[PDB]
């Protein structure tokens, strides 16, 4: 229940916190910005990595709750996603690293 509750509150925070401004942490056309944009598209625009896929705004914003027997709220899936987002995905020259040449953390 503690896990399901935290996840339940992380998605209410998504609906009530100000949006994330990448321009405040990453500057345009840099190794960090490009790396952030690639992985941000795999998360379907969600800047957070531990709340699955949920759009706070839009027609389907109401569907914030998760169904029973879900893996997203668990702590095992949380650590897995936070680690997959720490691996450098953009080489020093700005090109995406091949899927096979990516070193895990």
């Amino acid at each position: 229940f503690e896990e399901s509750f935290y996840f339940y509150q992380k998605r209410l925070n998504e609906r009530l916190t100000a949006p994330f401004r990448k321009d405040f942490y990453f500057k345009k056309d840099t190794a960090a910005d490009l790396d952030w944009r690639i992985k941000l598209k795999e998360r379907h625009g969600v800047p957070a990595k531990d709340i699955g896929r949920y759009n706070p705004r839009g027609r389907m914003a109401w569907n914030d709750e998760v169904l029973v027997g879900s893996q997203t709220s668990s702590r095992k899936h949380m650590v897995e996603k936070l680690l997959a987002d720490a691996e450098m995905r953009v080489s020093e020259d700005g090109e995406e690293i091949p899927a096979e040449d990516r070193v895990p953390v």
Partner: protein, 309 residues
Amino acid sequence: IPDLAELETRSALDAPIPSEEDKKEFRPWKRAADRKARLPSSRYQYHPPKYNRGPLHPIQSPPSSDPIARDFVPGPFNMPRLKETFRTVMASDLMTLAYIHTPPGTPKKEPTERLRAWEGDSPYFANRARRAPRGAPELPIRERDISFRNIPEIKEITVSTFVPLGLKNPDLLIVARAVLLAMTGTMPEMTRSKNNVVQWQLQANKPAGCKTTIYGNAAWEFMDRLIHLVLPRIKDWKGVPASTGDGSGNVQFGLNPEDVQLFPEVECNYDMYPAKMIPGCHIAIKTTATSDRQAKLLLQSLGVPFYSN
């Protein structure tokens, strides 16, 4: 039993767990699509008012715990590892370390009036005004013993900045407000100067700082970052002065502008701020303690070094 007969016959709580087949057929996304229309709105359309107009006004405001409320804040997101640490190991050590045994039938101590009254044979003493606080001009809070019912804990932390030169360069106040934002995760409130000093070029009633207060879990998380990731990186750091303390269980100290940028939240985007604009902060740790020695004993349990000075 007749008592059990007075309980509600049909209980939602004593219903069986949901069926797996029903779980498979429950698809909230397919309902909105299959409907191909918008369900009519409910006739209940109460929305919290923007102003509180009294306890007898027809329209009343709900408590902050109500999710639809205007001041609602999403609940906890995690357990601060320093709160679980304090409550798991250090709650009993401080209780065991500082313990005075009271015999079984010890009479309860009766507190004496702190604002004394004149007692004697002089007819003037009758209607005399109560005497002044003996010693200090304001009555200091009396120390409570560390019991199993009173374990000193951290309550809130106030990070404040004072930028006098911001009166000439307005951008020094914009940066100071942003550093204190990423550091604590809240929106600081601007403060103003209260005195007039020409030598220092200080003018009264002008914005010259910013202040944030973090409560609950946020304050336990900030302490961990400070203790384990910021303070261990300050070059030639000796420790919090042993003289810190206002006499009520609150510890205060300050950080340098070069130590404020050691905060992980400030070193990541350190290049987005103009040069030489990151300020120093005044960190005030408010605890449930009621003494200077209790607070210094509490912080030592969380891993704060104190030095003699």
